[PDB]
Amino acid sequence: GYAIGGYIGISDTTIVDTIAMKMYKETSSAINNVYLEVFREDSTGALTSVGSVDVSGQLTTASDYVEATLPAGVIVNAGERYVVRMRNATTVGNRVGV
């Protein structure tokens, strides 16, 4: 139930296809409902969701990169800001270490 995210700058405009974060799981118990999502920051500073993906299946106990493909491409432009949020709304209760 605790979500953490950071702002990402855009250097050159392109089409995004995947997002990555460095995280792992503390215990070896089964986990689910771990989501990585992307938010665009508007002019007013509000965050709008433009994509999300479940990454709980491919997580590993060892600290390793997690790369997940978005459902569809999200065009980005230089000058705007984006946030990659990890949600971790799991049901079993195993914590996530980022």
Binding site: Y7, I8, G9, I10, S11, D12, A78, G79, R81
Partner: protein
């Protein structure tokens, strides 16, 4: 028929003329826009773009 052919050729030349002028204007504007925009500094390097 000779005058009709001259009419057709002049119309074709006018079409080519306007297309070339429009293409030149569009190309130069594309150059200027690409030069104006482009790479911007990321968020961690600076606050400003």
């Amino acid at each position: 028929s000779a005058i009709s052919n001259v009419i057709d050729w002049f119309n074709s030349l006018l079409n080519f003329q306007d297309t070339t002028t429009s293409n030149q204007i569009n190309q130069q504007n594309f150059q200027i826009a690409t030069l104006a925009s482009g790479i911007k500094k990321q968020q961690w390097e600076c606050r400003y773009s």
